[PDB]
Write a protein that binds this ligand. Structure first.
Ligand code: CLA
Ligand code: CLA
Ligand code: CLA
Ligand code: CLA
Ligand code: CLA
Ligand code: CLA
Ligand code: CLA
Ligand code: CLA
Ligand SMILES: CCCCCCCCCCCCCCCC(=O)OC[C@H](COP(=O)(O)OC[C@@H](O)CO)OC(=O)CCCCCCCCCCCCCCC
Ligand SMILES: CCCCCCCCCCCCO[C@H]1O[C@H](CO)[C@@H](O[C@H]2O[C@H](CO)[C@@H](O)[C@H](O)[C@H]2O)[C@H](O)[C@H]1O
Ligand SMILES: CC1=C(C/C=C(\C)CCC[C@H](C)CCC[C@H](C)CCCC(C)C)C(=O)c2ccccc2C1=O
Lengths: 742, 80, 147, 124, 165, 144
């Protein structure tokens, strides 16, 4: 019964610049200094690999804790800059008056070498680069109405950034928590559930109830922003609040007398979108965060810390034991309290999956005012948070394999769930292998079938709505069920959560904010492409984790490590057997799969949702050509890539000309990467020998011997440039397109 | 079967024998070096060609060399 | 490729009489991408479309056929043998344990392609896709424009 | 040993397989070929008729689809024959021998084509 | 003129190009106020545009049928017709700087080879020595030639490692 | 030292089993058997995946290829300080013994071994490929 308590060590480390002048001090191998250029790369590669610098878990934990303060401090500088640039280099104040006609802008370029052309005409008597980060919509929702309010937040952001860097220094050099402190998982969950998420949600509900709701109620009514009461006047004067919301006339007595229905005027359950702004009702959002606050505060009292009541996480795991799984969840608690990599593998997996869920829900239920009709912001936010989720998931596979090689110990794992999974890995991979082959034929083969039938003049033989049909009946049933939910299954909800299920479109400023989305044969085909490319990515990453330690090819792969190039040309060749190489290959397939996801979103929205409302009806940007054209590969090449890339390639001479340059430059970086992927360092080391000879001939040869990159660094350099070039190419193509037409 | 040759620059460090994951190499008495021992390759039919032995040889140039040759079930490292 | 792009673009402008386009647009790389590759693909990719097809549908089909063989070559050049040999080992296990299929058996033990073989196989796909893509575009752009 | 599992080792599953023509020993290879060929041949006609290029023709659809199913059975019979030639060139069951498999392939052709023809008669 | 080109000052297409660029700037100007911040910036751009087209014509460049300046690279044609400032003079401008940078780096590399641990003098630069060598590089062409004539510029063939042949 | 004789009835470790074990090759071409003595019951890692408990006293395991046997030998020797030995077993019932070939592990020099594939020259003293051309087969200069 070890008590939960604060435990630190005083002055564990000395604050000196001595080690700043001795590169490689952290590692025994690199401390001796460089002899070849390979040393330089090894310095940066192993800088943050704490688990390999020392075998002491306590020393590892202390570095992780303070390295996290540095990450927090950097985000505050970044957040402070975004708020500061909104105050000083933006047209936010003009945007508040005419949100539907003025383009948000918060970056201005200096007039040098003729780059001032990038300062485009955005509206409000302002010249600058149009932004797609959606900060203007966020600031309006919170109630910000002046650049002074933006300026104060930026100054507060810098103070927080200074506090974060002080905390990191303090908790590493002055008062470093001990290992027993870090292992109070029950205590940490209690505070992070009820304290971080719980009180954070309640505190934000306080801001919305007292600041956001009154300010946005008057803004929607048409009141001039400068004439709206200041947030503190709303807080101090209950009389003003009563006018906007009569419930405030009764104070907090209804809350304590359980007459919660009195607050129905500002704690609503409307559903749908606000017709004036096209975003979610803020009164709905306030009741959301009040409900979420109570749920998490209750969640934070589940685990036992010091007073008997509560649950022991170890006891829960050991009680869940069945007939089919041997010992069961035994041994997981020790794994998850002694391996940082195991914790990181889980957290990256769900944090990445969460970021992808955010992308889907924010576009379908636009939570900010004027977010929906700003098509550039909608496209950018969905695409940004899909890419973030994709990288995090691939990292989850990377750090699951690191655990398997370094932190896995067979003695603690005998006949438990983890052990039994390893003992039928061939069954898992063989079945997942077949599923991927099945999904590739029956999804991408359909496109090849349609392309061949179309080229042969046999349109009646294609898979399409006017031909052999493939209707997503299951998805269509769910769309109808959610559309009728308010009638019978959610009686107290006035409207459906989203307008995608069905109903009538909402138009703001003559543009569609959201309307029902219909699923047809093309949607059926593209969705099963997603299932195919996701399943393949699982195969590559899961295979690396399950075979990290050994396989039928390399029986002792664990001893070789997590990151090695091969085990030589024997046995036919063993290139890229290490678990690190399964992340390297998994990155390509993740990039392949998410590229189709963001092409699917971009074409579907322009074709079927986005458009201009007129007297006759809705005219969409691409005129509803998704249904008939997206069933062939040729349709994607012609109608999507070739037609929509018109904007980016005609950008020269305009404010969007920067996107044209980056479109070419991205194409360059991508092709440049194939040099590293298609070659090997054997050629390059011999090439450097001849180059070194010329320098030797001129007495200008370096003391640090030039070396071709290692085998692994060639693969890492290749994939990093491949991803940057590919992703930046889509980034330029999307923004130049949507900003130009959207 | 691969071909493995030991050259007279061997210093008898034994690192090639330790590195080999198939017990292809062994040390034998010799008089051509201070260690009075030399590497030997009596069981090359079990060699797979991994070249871990070459990775472990300190001499420059190598004193143990592997020349990949005809393939077989053993040299191809198959368990099926 | 650079030689044949240069020969083709300088001649298309001559054959249309508007040599000024090459003189003005050929000095920067956006002109090549915009005024040569993108501009002259319009007829090629319309060989077959949701409304019908014409005589260029064979070159439109071959154009995508080339892109596919080219992209398939990347697989043999980027991913190397060790990954595939270990994957094939679970396929060997699956066949032997499957009832009603282990009655049939192979005579040559399945293995992954060799290190050297995959470089040739990847280079062959890369070259074929290279050639077929430009052959379809070269003929289609020139023939449709005038022929 | 191998990972025991109900699918790999169960009583009900084992009995079902033991009654299939492939595993039913004591039967001449030719007869097993006919029994196996008939089952596959009968099914093979389905997809060709419903989804073939001439599926929408009123009466030609049945003939064209079945005639293509007969062709595929002929190709499969060749695959069976050459497989026996390669596999058995030099044991408990007669089927797994050069003599047994050659009879097996011949039976499959006779049974398979009969099944395709029998499927056609069902339609008309 | 040279190669069929004509002076930009006398080129019809060159003059028309200036109007197009100024017209584009003027079109954006009329959507702002007289002395607003955007208007002042646009007016500044127009002044630079007018200055640029006057400078290139004053420099006596040659314009093609495209009406854009073209440069002359042959030293004989450049000095013959006063185009030395396009390529010829900048050629010797770059080489002086390029040799300056290369010569300074070579001097520093030789200097630290005598030290006990040359490798640590490369990742961690000896700034006092580097600044000393930075200033002395202004006379690199003189120093470079004298090394060549004294035979200390190149290593001996017998002191350079080479592969078997 | 004399060549040990394999005892097929030797007990095997406590292992549930896995899908990474022997295949049809063991029944047609060959397989490998490794045996050793255990001082106490302990958990070790199977090269085929998973964890097994070694019984006190003799233990016996069967593997699909030689490298798997010698991978387990390295573990037992280096970590648990045991002294295993393994054989090659053919479907006909013949048993071939190896590692240690002469009873002493190859890392340690032992009298009586005869040098094999030893060239009394350096790598740089091999003849050129032209001088071993048309020798009836592809031959490296190192072979001659
Ligand atoms: C989010 C970014 C981030 C963060 C939080 C850290 C954090 C850390 N790095 Mg890392 N690092 C990063 C990015 C980051 N790094 C990147 C991108 C690289 C290049 C590949 C490196 C390369 C690197 C090296 C080579 C080293 C570190 C080291 C460190 C540690 C000590 C740093 C210190 O005392 O700073 C003190 C900071 C301040 C006083 C702030 C003001 C001064 C700065 C310069 C502004 C610490 C765990 C050192 C270490 O000991 O690692 C174990 C070390 O040797 N880092
Ligand atoms: C994520 C952080 C971030 C980023 C990427 C930028 C980026 C930029 N800032 Mg900003 N800035 C930030 C945070 C950030 N800022 C913060 C936290 C503050 C508060 C102190 C400021 C205060 C600030 C000012 C006062 C100015 C900028 C300006 C600039 C621009 C020119 C910077 C430059 O070359 O300086 C010069 C480079 C070196 C000194 C090296 C550039 C777009 C300038 C701008 O946009 O001018 C039109 C400008 O005047 N920034
Ligand atoms: C001025 C204050 C100061 C000083 C003198 C030291 C001194 C020391 N620290 Mg401490 N430290 C400080 C502040 C300081 N620290 C702060 C503020 C933190 C909180 C983050 C830490 C956290 C910390 C950790 C966790 C560790 C140390 C360690 C060390 C030792 C080596 C550090 C080193 O090599 O840094 C040289 C490193 C750098 C100069 C890199 C700076 C990285 C920062 C975060 C900036 C990141 C910028 C980012 C990449 C920007 C984007 C890049 C992109 C644009 C390209 C040394 C005793 C290490 C130690 O004792 O090891 C035994 C160690 O593990 N420190
Ligand atoms: C109610 C208490 C509480 C709260 C609010 C937090 C909050 C946080 N913890 Mg947790 N933590 C707690 C209790 C708490 N913890 C306890 C009791 C333990 C010991 C078992 C831990 C152990 C722990 C570890 C080991 C780590 C965290 C980390 C984090 C941060 C995760 C990133 C994030 O969401 O940043 C959101 C950012 C903000 C909300 C703004 C900055 C932080 C504000 C000001 C809240 C400060 C809360 C703090 C505990 C209050 C006292 C500070 C000081 C005066 C003593 C986050 C700030 C991770 C981290 O990033 O550390 C740096 C991390 O590595 N915590
Ligand atoms: C965390 C969120 C949060 C916060 C901070 C607040 C805060 C506030 N709400 Mg709000 N509210 C919230 C959530 C929140 N609310 C939610 C979720 C709901 C929905 C149920 C409401 C519904 C609601 C209503 C209906 C009303 C308020 C009101 C108020 C105000 C007065 C409350 C009151 O009577 O307090 C009573 C007393 C206290 C809170 C204790 C104060 C203790 C002080 C700070 C101690 C200081 C001690 C220190 C040593 C002294 C200084 C010394 C120094 C100078 C030397 C106050 C600004 C009322 C108002 O005026 O609205 C305009 C009001 O009518 N709220
Ligand atoms: C919370 C996130 C997180 C954290 C804390 C870590 C932490 C760690 N990872 Mg993990 N990882 C993550 C996410 C994370 N990872 C994700 C999302 C992936 C998938 C891509 C991976 C994939 C991964 C691999 C494959 C490996 C690690 C490794 C490591 C360890 C050493 C890292 C190191 O030294 O980097 C040092 C940092 C650098 C050398 C800088 C990298 C710079 C990149 C390539 C720049 C890319 C472009 C840039 C962002 C934008 C343009 C820049 C401009 C200048 C052009 C360390 C424990 C390594 C290890 O050995 O672990 C045991 C290791 O092998 N990680
Ligand atoms: C366009 C390029 C391309 C193509 C077609 C493939 C195809 C494939 N890859 Mg590969 N891959 C590529 C690029 C490509 N890859 C690249 C660039 C990389 C490097 C990053 C990789 C890395 C990689 C890995 C690491 C893996 C794959 C996997 C796969 C397979 C997925 C499952 C499957 O069988 O689908 C079905 C097959 C197809 C869709 C191929 C086309 C089929 C056509 C359209 C129909 C059939 C034709 C028909 C029979 C007519 C033939 C006539 C003729 C005989 C005369 C498949 C063979 C995974 C795998 O093997 O999973 C089992 C796997 O693990 N790839
Ligand atoms: C890179 C190679 C190259 C080439 C292809 C040319 C080509 C040309 N040069 Mg140039 N030239 C070059 C390099 C070159 N030069 C260099 C490195 C220098 C020294 C810095 C000069 C110095 C130079 C002068 C001084 C003159 C030319 C002239 C010419 C033209 C006719 C004579 C000539 O050079 O014939 C072919 C070129 C060669 C065989 C290579 C060597 C050329 C020597 C150095 C100059 C020959 C000048 C010639 C005797 C003049 C006679 C009168 C002329 C009107 C017929 C011709 C356009 C003449 C001109 O302006 O004509 C209109 C002229 O007067 N060149
Ligand atoms: C579904 C299968 C549920 C299976 C299920 O719930 O089983 C339930 C069963 C749980 O048995 P126990 O009661 O002994 O488990 C006690 C637990 O507390 C864990 O220790 O799990 C297993 O037997 C594990 C292996 C299942 C092997 C499943 C093979 C088929 C996988 C198919 C994957 C399809 C994915 C579709 C995604 C939409
Ligand atoms: C954790 C708990 C954190 C609590 C933080 C509380 C911060 C409060 C700041 C605002 C102070 O104002 C809060 O109390 C005042 C005094 O009763 C109320 O004042 C109200 O009632 C007074 C009664 O005499 C009247 O004189 C005021 O005109 C009227 O506005 C405000 O309507 C209320 O918003
Ligand atoms: C090109 C290439 C190389 C050669 C690339 C190298 C050696 C990296 C070059 C990095 C820079 C350009 C050199 C170091 C520059 C110094 C830091 C000094 C710069 C000083 C100023 C100019 C900034 C490989 O080593 C390689 C290895 C494995 C597979 C593929 C490849 C591969 O394709």
């Amino acid at each position: 019964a070890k008590k939960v308590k604060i435990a630190v060590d005083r002055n564990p480390v000395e604050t000196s610049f001595e080690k700043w002048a001795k590169p490689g001090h952290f590692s025994r191998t690199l401390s001796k200094g460089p002899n070849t250029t390979t040393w330089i790369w090894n310095l940066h590669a192993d800088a943050h690999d704490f688990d390999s610098h020392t075998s002491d878990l306590e020393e590892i934990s202390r570095k992780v804790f303070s390295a996290h303060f540095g990450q927090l401090g950097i985000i505050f500088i970044w957040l402070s800059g975004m708020y500061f640039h909104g105050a000083r280099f933006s047209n936010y104040e003009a945007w508040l008056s005419d949100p539907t006609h003025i383009k948000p802008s918060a970056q201005v370029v200096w007039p040098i070498v003729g780059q001032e052309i990038l300062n485009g005409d955005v509206g409000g008597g302002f010249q600058g680069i149009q932004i797609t980060s959606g900060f203007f919509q966020l600031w309006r929702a919170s109630g910000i109405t002046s650049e002074l309010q933006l300026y104060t937040t930026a100054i507060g952001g810098l103070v927080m950034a200074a506090a974060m860097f002080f905390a990191g220094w303090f908790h590493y050099h002055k008062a470093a928590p001990k290992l027993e402190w870090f292992q109070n998982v029950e205590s940490m969950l209690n505070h992070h559930l009820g304290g971080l998420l719980g009180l954070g949600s309640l505190a934000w509900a306080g801001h919305q109830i007292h600041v956001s709701l009154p300010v946005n109620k008057l803004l929607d009514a048409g009141v001039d922003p400068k004439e709206i009461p200041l947030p503190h006047d709303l807080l101090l004067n209950r009389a003003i609040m009563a006018d906007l919301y009569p419930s405030f006339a009764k104070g907090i007595a209804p809350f304590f007398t359980l007459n919660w229905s009195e607050y129905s005027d500002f704690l609503t359950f409307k559903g749908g979108l606000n017709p004036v702004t096209g975003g979610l009702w803020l009164s709905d959002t306030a009741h959301h965060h009040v409900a979420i606050a109570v749920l998490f505060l209750v969640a934070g009292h589940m685990y036992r810390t010091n007073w008997g009541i509560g649950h022991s996480m170890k006891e829960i795991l050991e009680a869940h034991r069945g007939p089919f799984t041997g010992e069961g969840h035994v041994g997981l608690y020790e794994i998850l309290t002694t391996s940082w990599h195991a914790q990181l593998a889980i957290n990256l997996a769900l944090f990445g999956s969460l970021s992808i869920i955010v992308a889907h829900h924010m576009y379908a239920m636009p939570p900010y005012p004027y977010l929906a009709t700003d098509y550039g912001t909608q496209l950018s936010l969905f695409t940004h948070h899909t890419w973030i989720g994709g990288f995090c998931i691939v990292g989850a596979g990377a750090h699951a394999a690191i655990f398997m090689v370094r932190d896995y110990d067979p003695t603690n794992n005998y006949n438990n769930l983890l052990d039994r999974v390893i003992r039928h890995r061939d069954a898992i991979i063989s079945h997942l292998n077949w599923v991927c082959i099945f999904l590739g034929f029956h999804s991408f083969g359909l496109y090849i079938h349609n392309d061949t039938m179309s080229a042969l003049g046999r349109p009646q033989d294609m898979f399409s709505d006017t031909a052999i049909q493939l209707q997503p009946v299951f998805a269509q049933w769910i769309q109808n069920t959610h559309f009728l939910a308010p009638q019978l299954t959610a009686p107290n909800a006035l409207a459906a959560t989203s307008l995608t299920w069905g109903g009538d479109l909402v138009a703001v400023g003559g543009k569609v904010a959201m309307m029902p989305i219909s699923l047809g044969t093309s949607d059926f085909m593209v969705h099963h492409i997603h299932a195919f490319t996701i399943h393949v990515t699982v195969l590559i990453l899961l295979k690396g984790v399950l075979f990290a330690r050994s396989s039928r090819l390399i029986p002792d792969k664990a001893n070789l490590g997590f990151r090695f190039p091969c085990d030589g040309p024997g046995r036919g060749g063993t290139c890229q057997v290490s678990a690190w190489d399964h992340v390297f290959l998994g990155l390509f397939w993740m990039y392949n799969s998410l590229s189709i996801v963001i092409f699917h979103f971009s074409w579907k929205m322009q074709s079927d949702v986005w458009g201009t409302v007129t007297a006759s009806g809705v005219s969409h940007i691409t005129g509803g050509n998704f249904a008939q054209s997206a069933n062939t590969i040729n349709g994607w090449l012609r109608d999507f890539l070739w037609a929509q890339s018109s904007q980016v390639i005609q950008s020269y001479g305009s404010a969007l000309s920067a996107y044209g340059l980056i479109f070419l430059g991205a194409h360059f970086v991508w092709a440049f990467s194939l040099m590293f992927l298609f070659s090997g360092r054997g050629y390059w080391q011999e090439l450097i020998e001849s180059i070194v000879w010329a320098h030797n001939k001129l007495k200008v040869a370096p003391a640090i011997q030039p070396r071709a990159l290692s085998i692994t660094q060639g693969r890492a350099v290749g994939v990093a440039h491949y991803l940057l070039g590919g992703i930046a190419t889509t980034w330029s193509f999307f923004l130049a397109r949507i900003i130009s037409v959207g | 079967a691969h071909i493995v040759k030991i050259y007279d620059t061997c210093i008898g460090c034994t690192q090639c024998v330790r590195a080999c994951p198939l017990d292809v190499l062994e040390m034998v008495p010799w008089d051509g070096c201070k260690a009075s021992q030399m590497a030997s390759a009596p069981r090359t039919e079990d060699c797979v060609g991994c070249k871990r032995c070459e990775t472990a040889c300190p001499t420059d140039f190598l004193s143990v060399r592997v020349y990949l040759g005809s393939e077989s079930t053993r040299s191809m490292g198959l368990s099926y | 490729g650079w030689v044949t792009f240069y020969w083709h673009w300088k001649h298309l402008t001559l054959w249309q009489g508007n040599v000024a386009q090459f003189d003005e647009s050929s000095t920067y790389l956006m002109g090549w991408l915009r005024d040569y590759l993108w501009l002259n693909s319009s007829q090629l990719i319309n060989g077959y479309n949701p409304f019908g097809m014409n005589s260029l549908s064979v070159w439109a089909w071959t154009f995508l056929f080339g892109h596919l063989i080219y992209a398939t070559g990347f697989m043999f050049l980027i991913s190397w043998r060790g990954y595939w040999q270990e994957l094939i080992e679970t396929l060997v296990w699956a066949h032997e344990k499957t009832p009603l299929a282990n009655l049939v058996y192979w005579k040559d033990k399945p293995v992954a392609l060799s290190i050297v073989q995959a470089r040739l196989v990847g280079l062959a796909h890369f070259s074929v896709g290279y050639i077929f893509t430009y052959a379809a575009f070269l003929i289609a752009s020139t023939s449709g424009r005038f022929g | 040993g191998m990972l025991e599992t109900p699918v790999t080792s169960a009583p009900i599953v084992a009995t079902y397989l033991s009654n299939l023509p492939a595993y039913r020993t004591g039967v001449a290879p030719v007869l097993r070929g006919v029994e196996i060929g008939l089952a596959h041949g009968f099914l093979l006609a389905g997809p060709f008729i419903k989804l073939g290029p001439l599926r929408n023709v009123p009466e030609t659809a049945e003939i064209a689809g079945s005639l293509s199913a007969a062709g595929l059975v002929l190709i499969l019979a060749l695959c069976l024959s050459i497989y026996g030639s390669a596999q058995f060139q030099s044991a408990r069951d007669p089927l797994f021998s050069a003599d047994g498999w050659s009879e097996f392939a011949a039976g499959f052709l006779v049974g398979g084509e009969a099944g395709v023809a029998w499927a056609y008669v069902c339609t008309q | 003129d040279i190669a069929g080109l004509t002076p930009c000052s006398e080129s019809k297409a060159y003059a028309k190009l200036e109007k197009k660029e100024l017209k584009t700037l003027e079109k954006r100007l009329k959507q702002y106020e007289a002395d607003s911040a955007p208007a002042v910036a646009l007016k500044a751009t127009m002044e630079r545009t007018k200055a640029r087209f006057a400078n290139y014509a004053k420099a006596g460049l040659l314009c093609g049928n495209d009406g854009l300046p073209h440069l002359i690279a042959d030293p004989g044609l450049a000095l013959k017709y006063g185009h030395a400032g396009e390529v010829f003079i900048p050629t010797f401008g770059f080489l002086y700087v390029a040799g300056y940078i290369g010569y300074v780096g070579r001097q520093y590399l030789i200097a630290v080879k005598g030290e006990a641990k040359p490798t640590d003098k490369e990742i961690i630069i000896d700034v006092p020595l580097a600044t000393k060598l930075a200033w002395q590089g202004a006379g690199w062409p003189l120093a470079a030639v004298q090394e060549l004539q004294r035979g200390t510029l190149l290593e001996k063939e017998e002191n350079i490692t080479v592969s078997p042949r | 030292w004399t060549v040990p004789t394999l005892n097929p009835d030797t007990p095997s470790p406590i292992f549930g089993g896995s899908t990474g074990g022997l295949l049809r090759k063991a029944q047609t071409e060959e397989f490998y058997v490794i045996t050793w003595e255990a001082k106490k019951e302990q958990i070790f890692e199977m090269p085929t995946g998973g964890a097994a408990i070694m019984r006190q006293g003799p233990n016996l395991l069967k593997f699909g290829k030689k490298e798997q046997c010698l991978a387990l030998t390295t573990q037992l020797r280096n970590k648990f300080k045991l002294t295993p030995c393994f054989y090659r077993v053919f479907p006909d019932g013949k048993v071939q013994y190896l590692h240690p070939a002469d009873g002493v592990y190859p890392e340690k020099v032992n009298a009586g071994r005869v040098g094999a594939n030893q060239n009394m020259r350096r790598i740089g003293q091999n003849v050129n490929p032209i001088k071993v051309k048309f020798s009836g087969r592809m031959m490296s200069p190192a072979e001659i």
